[PDB]
Design a protein around this ligand. Structure first.
Ligand code: HEM
Ligand SMILES: CC1(C)[C@H]2CC(=O)[C@]1(C)C[C@H]2O
Length: 405
């Protein structure tokens, strides 16, 4: 439960927030985390939950810490410590200048050029999935669209069979929103047992898939090793299977409850990209951290070497000092400020793929199914963790109001 306060922590900086089970979760996960920004809470606090760790609450401190890799290292990015220590994914667990070489290779596989190439399949899969659901008049969005749409596209990119989805998805979820059924290390090992054989095969007989490209890539002049390949692909898996999936659900949940926002996107399509940024701001869902490389005084607070600090990317855009009326969704804000895809040297490489998948969903869904809402008597429950999610999203609609294409 609560760990004993360390000697160097002033007790007035204590605020016991549990990132895996915040108190007001019933009101929404973003709302639950936003309590960290109430006037009674200092900008930098220490929680005794999950082993004890700091949490920066303002977009300003979050950006700073993310830029200063000298004091805030990526080596142990996950909390609790045990997870941050077992964490060895590349390029994430590396600090510059080492990260740089690996980031470039990962970029080759999920960067802009790959997205432009996959565009037609993304579009195709979206239209197909939506059209197949359209006449039914109901669906559980999380499992009927949010999961298959992003995941199948990734399985297509990586060259992995759809049959492995259930297994891989389970392991991934244990890493971001631990059930308690298994430790991060055990989750990490199982994913690795899966990847190792595949990597071996693709080193011997290269294909055009992302895995073959990584497994045979060159880093710093020499060839990548199997271990380095295994660790980079491990990261790609977690990113492809547990990010866009959850985000689509928060957005769709909001849309089902706000006819005014749906209509806006239907009558003025040129707004969709702007809407996408705003939804990414309001429904930001990631929260990881860094480890202190040495004693350091950050904004008047003395941090000691070894201290882990949670720097919630989710909070930057919900900060009122950053965005006026943060909880209000406004597709016409003059400036949408956020760090949803991160900040600093570890800025999300898969952000282009994410945005394309989001915009395609919005446009294609609103075209065929303009009017829809949350099923009567359904309680939507969110879940918190390194990456937040929606448990299930029961949606209902009148088929007679849909348009086939
Ligand atoms: C819903 C969209 C997504 C969000 C919100 C998101 C968020 C993030 C965040 C916050 C980071 C920074 C982590 C840190 O600084 O410790 C990150 C890194 C990364 N993301 Fe994403 N991501 C998304 C989708 C994806 C997708 C689709 C992939 C592709 C498989 C992916 C691959 C990566 C990679 C490779 C990195 C590591 C970059 C590096 O270490 O240099 N992400 N992502
Ligand atoms: C924090 C992240 C969302 C980012 C780095 C990770 O380990 C993830 C859990 C997947 C990837 O997109």
């Amino acid at each position: 439960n609560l760990a004993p306060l360390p000697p160097h922590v002033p007790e007035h900086l204590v605020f016991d927030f549990d990132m895996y089970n915040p108190s007001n979760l019933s009101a929404g996960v973003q709302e639950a985390w936003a309590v960290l920004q109430e006037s009674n809470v200092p900008d930098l606090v220490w929680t005794r939950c999950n082993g004890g760790h700091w949490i920066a609450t303002r977009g300003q401190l979050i950006r700073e810490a993310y830029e200063d890799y000298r004091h805030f290292s990526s080596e142990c990015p996950f909390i609790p410590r045990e997870a941050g220590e077992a964490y060895d994914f590349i390029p994430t667990s590396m600090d510059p200048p080492e990260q740089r070489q690996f980031r470039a290779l990962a970029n080759q596989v999920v960067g802009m050029p790959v997205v432009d190439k996959l565009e037609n399949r993304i579009q195709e899969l979206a239209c197909s999935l939506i059209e197949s659901l359209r006449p039914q008049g109901q669906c559980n969005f999380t499992e009927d669209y949010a999961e298959p749409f992003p995941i199948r596209i990734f399985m297509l990119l990586a060259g992995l069979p759809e049959e492995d989805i259930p297994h891989l998805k389970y392991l991934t979820d244990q890493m971001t929103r631990p059930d308690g059924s298994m430790t991060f290390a055990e989750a990490k090992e199982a994913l690795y047992d899966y990847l190792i054989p595949i990597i071996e095969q693709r080193r011997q007989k290269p294909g055009t898939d992302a895995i073959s490209i990584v497994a045979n890539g060159q880093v710093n002049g020499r060839p990548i090793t199997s271990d380095e390949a295994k660790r980079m692909c491990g990261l790609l898996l977690v990113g492809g299977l547990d990010t866009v999936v959850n985000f689509l659900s928060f957005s769709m949940e909001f849309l089902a409850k706000s006819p005014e926002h749906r209509q806006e996107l239907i009558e003025r399509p040129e707004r969709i990209p702007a809407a996408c940024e705003e939804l990414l701001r309001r429904f930001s869902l990631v929260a990881d951290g860094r480890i202190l490389t040495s004693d350091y005084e950050f904004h008047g607070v003395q941090l000691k070497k070894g201290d882990q600090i949670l720097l919630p990317q989710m909070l930057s855009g919900l900060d009122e000092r950053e965005n006026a009326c943060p909880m209000h969704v406004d597709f016409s804000r003059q400036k949408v400020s956020h760090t949803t895809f991160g900040h600093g040297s570890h800025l999300c490489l898969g952000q282009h793929l994410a945005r394309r998948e989001i915009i395609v969903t919005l446009k294609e869904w609103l075209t065929r199914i303009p009017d829809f809402s949350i099923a009567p008597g359904a309680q939507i429950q969110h879940k918190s963790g390194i990456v937040s999610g929606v448990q299930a999203l029961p949606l209902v609609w009148d088929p007679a109001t849909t348009k086939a294409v």
